[PDB]
Amino acid sequence: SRIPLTLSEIEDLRRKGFNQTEIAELYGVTRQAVSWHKKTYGGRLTTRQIVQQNWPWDTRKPHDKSKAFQRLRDHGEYMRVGSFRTMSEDKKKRLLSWWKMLRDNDLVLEFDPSIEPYEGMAGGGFRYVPRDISDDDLLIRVNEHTQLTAEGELLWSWPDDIEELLS
DNA sequence: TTTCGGTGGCTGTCAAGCGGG
DNA sequence: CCCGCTTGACAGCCACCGAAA
């Protein structure tokens, strides 16, 4: 009825732009079966996954619903890719607006898992505070709940040419 | 009009367990 | 054993909808 599902075949179909769920449907297995093969035999990681390896917090649901979480993810993606070529127009507009707001009001983002959601932060967990010098070029506040790796310092700082993109 | 938060469904990963060599 | 799967639970991702400039 077919050829047993190997990592190479899934990777080939991914290169062709198919995702793991569609591949699972193609081979009559669960997406988890497709994921296991990728996880077990070292399948390439997308930019988002790479950014995830260097994510600064132990977040849960429903933190993923806050706009700060989504915008910071988009920012990490931009710094990793280095241009907007892999982002939709919406991600670009929203990210630039977020940067402009963040820069002009001199704030950095802080995370504390005990803060409960409130109006304008539907996922809870995040809050904006004014930058002090220890923050340098970072868009984030380092606190007891932030684990920042060597790779992370590059991801969570402003781009060097940030002034040119805004006007 | 365009902008921005909130929301939902879909996507993907991990841990533990099962069955066929 | 191990290898390939599935079940269940949780975290993250991205465009659409509507109300507020």
Numbering used by the authors: 15 to 181
Published text:
To maintain lysogeny and prevent entry into the lytic replication cycle, temperate bacteriophages encode a repressor protein that binds specific operator sites in the phage genome to repress the transcription of genes required for lytic growth. A large group of mycobacteriophages code for repressors that are unusual in also terminating transcription elongation at numerous binding sites (stoperators) distributed across the phage genome. Here we present the X-ray crystal structure of a mycobacteriophage repressor from the cluster A bacteriophage TipsytheTRex bound to DNA. The structure reveals that the repressor monomer contains two DNA-binding domains, an N-terminal HTH and a second domain that is a variation of the HTH motif.
The first is an N-terminal HTH (residues 15–55) that was correctly predicted from the repressor sequence. The second domain (residues 75–181), which we have named the Stoperator domain, contains within it a fold that is a variation of the HTH motif (residues 75–118). The DNA adopts a traditional B-form structure, with the HTH and Stoperator binding at successive openings of the major groove on the same face of the DNA in a manner similar to a cI dimer8. A small helix, which we have termed the helix bridge (residues 56–74), sits above the minor groove and connects the two DNA-binding domains. As expected, the HTH, helix bridge, and Stoperator are all rich in positive charge at the DNA contact points, and a PISA analysis shows that protein:DNA interactions in the structure result in 1636 Å2 of buried surface area. Additionally, while in typical HTH domains only the third, recognition helix is inserted into the DNA major groove, in the Stoperator domain portions of both α5 and α6 are inserted into the major groove where they contact the DNA. The C-terminal region of the Stoperator domain (residues 128–181) is the only portion of the protein that does not contact DNA, and this region appears to be quite flexible. An electrostatic potential surface rendering shows that this part of the protein is acidic in nature, in agreement with the high D and E content present in the C-terminus. Previous work reported a spontaneously arising L5 clear plaque mutant that contained an R108L mutation in the L5 repressor and could no longer form lysogens, which suggests that the interaction between R108 and DNA observed in this structure is essential for formation of the repressor:DNA complex.
